[PDB]
Amino acid sequence: VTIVMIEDDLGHARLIEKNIRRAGVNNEIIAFTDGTSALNYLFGDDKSGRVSAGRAQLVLLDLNLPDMTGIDILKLVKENPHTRRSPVVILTTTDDQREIQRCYDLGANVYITKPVNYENFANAIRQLGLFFSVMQVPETEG
Amino acid sequence: VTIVMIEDDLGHARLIEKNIRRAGVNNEIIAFTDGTSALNYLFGDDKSGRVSAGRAQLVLLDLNLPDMTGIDILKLVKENPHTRRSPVVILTTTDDQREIQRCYDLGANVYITKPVNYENFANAIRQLGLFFSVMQVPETEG
Numbered sequence: 001v002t003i004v005m006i007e008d009d010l011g012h013a014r015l016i017e018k019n020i021r022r023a024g025v026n027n028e029i030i031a032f033t034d035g036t037s038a039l040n041y042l043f044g045d046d047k048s049g050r051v052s053a054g055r056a057q058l059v060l061l062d063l064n065l066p067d068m069t070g071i072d073i074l075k076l077v078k079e080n081p082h083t084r085r086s087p088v089v090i091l092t093t094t095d096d097q098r099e100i101q102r103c104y105d106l107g108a109n110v111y112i113t114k115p116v117n118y119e120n121f122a123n124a125i126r127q128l129g130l131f132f133s134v135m136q137v138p139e140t141e142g
Numbered sequence: 143v144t145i146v147m148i149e150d151d152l153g154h155a156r157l158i159e160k161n162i163r164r165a166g167v168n169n170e171i172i173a174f175t176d177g178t179s180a181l182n183y184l185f186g187d188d189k190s191g192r193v194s195a196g197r198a199q200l201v202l203l204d205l206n207l208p209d210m211t212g213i214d215i216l217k218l219v220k221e222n223p224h225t226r227r228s229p230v231v232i233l234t235t236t237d238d239q240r241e242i243q244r245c246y247d248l249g250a251n252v253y254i255t256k257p258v259n260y261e262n263f264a265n266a267i268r269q270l271g272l273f274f275s276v277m278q279v280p281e282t283e284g
Contacts (some may be wrong), residue, residue: 084190085246100278104227109251124257125275131273136242136253 005031005072006038008065012132014116016060016091016125028135035068037062039076042081042083050105056134056139063092069109071106078107089128127138143279144199145171148180148215149233150208154256154263158202158233161264164272177210182217184225195224195240198272198281205234205241211247213241220249227282 003020007013010033017029032038042059044051059077063070070092078084087109095113102110112128115121145162149155165170174180186193191217201219206210212234219225220283234241239267245253254270257263 015238021243033145085243087246087252095278099229099278104229110229111280112276113278127269127272127276130269134254136237136255138239138243138246138253 001058003027003029003132004040004042004057004059005029006035006059006065006070007031007062008033009062012062012121016120018124019122020129020132023133025124025129025132027132028031029035033066035073036071038073042073044079052080052086053082054139055086056137058087058089058137060089060091062123063090063094068139071102074103074106074108081141083099083106085138086104086134087137091125091128129133143169144197145169146183146199146201146261147171147173147181148176148177148207148212149173150200150204150206153202157264158262160265161267163273164264165268165275167271167275168272175208177207177212177215180186181215186221187220191224193220193224194222194228194282195284196281197224197226197245198279199229200279201228201230203230203235205232205236205245207225213245216245216248216250224282224284225279229279233270 005016013031015067042052043049061073061091074088077088090103090108090111092113093114115124147158149158159171163252184194185191203215216230219228219230232245232250232253233256235256242253257266
């Protein structure tokens with residue numbers, strides 16, 4: 001079971017990662033700072049998604065990416081039969097209800113607005129790590 | 143934001159409830175010990191689900207109910223417009239892939255296998271309550 005972290009802000013990226021570690025989670029964390037590299041990983045060279053077939057992974061997704069919108073990755077993921085079952089957790093800046101509703105309708109499992117306050121942000125990630133250890137992350141179809 | 147707890151085991155129902163409070167969550171919790179009344183509240187007497195339109199609610203669901211199976215409650219909630227946007231957290235005893243994968247395929251936002259150890263069980267709920275206060279719970283369509 002792996003954690004796929006799609007975040008472009010390197011500061012948040014390293015903050016999230018270490019607070020996950022502080023939660024006791026020792027799972028492999030594969031990160032991407034843009035949508036292009038993250039999609040290649042989730043869908044493979046041929047973009048079919050089959051490389052994700054049978055994978056047990058959870059994806060953290062910042063909506064604001066440089067080369068595309070996180071929403072696209074969400075739709076792609078929840079549409080493909082080899083990735084859709086992967087729990088997607090939106091972890092982004094905006095707390096725009098329209099954006100929240102849209103994300104859930106697109107298939108997001110959980111949506112989290114990044115707290116402003118550093119302490120609040122680090123604590124939230126830590127809770128996420130603890131919750132992660134409590135949930136069941138399923139493998140996608142083969 | 144209302145937490146709808148669908149659990150028939152009175153012992154677990156009381157453990158879940160107090161540990162949610164233990165986590166500092168003061169949200170209204172409406173409990174149902176059978177699936178019938180639970181579906182009644184969620185969909186109404188007309189069964190259209192309009193009673194749920196615009197509601198912001200998280201649902202805790204045990205799959206092992208006395209009058210039906212929670213999986214079908216999940217299927218109904220995730221198919222109807224005024225309840226599908228509601229995050230559903232499966233909280234049950236079983237832990238075999240087939241059930242977990244089916245719940246996610248049916249639309250469950252999260253699946254948590256009840257920890258066997260009472261204390262781990264209580265702590266996990268506390269962990270669930272903390273995460274709840276960190277995530278965004280959307281309102282359903284109108």
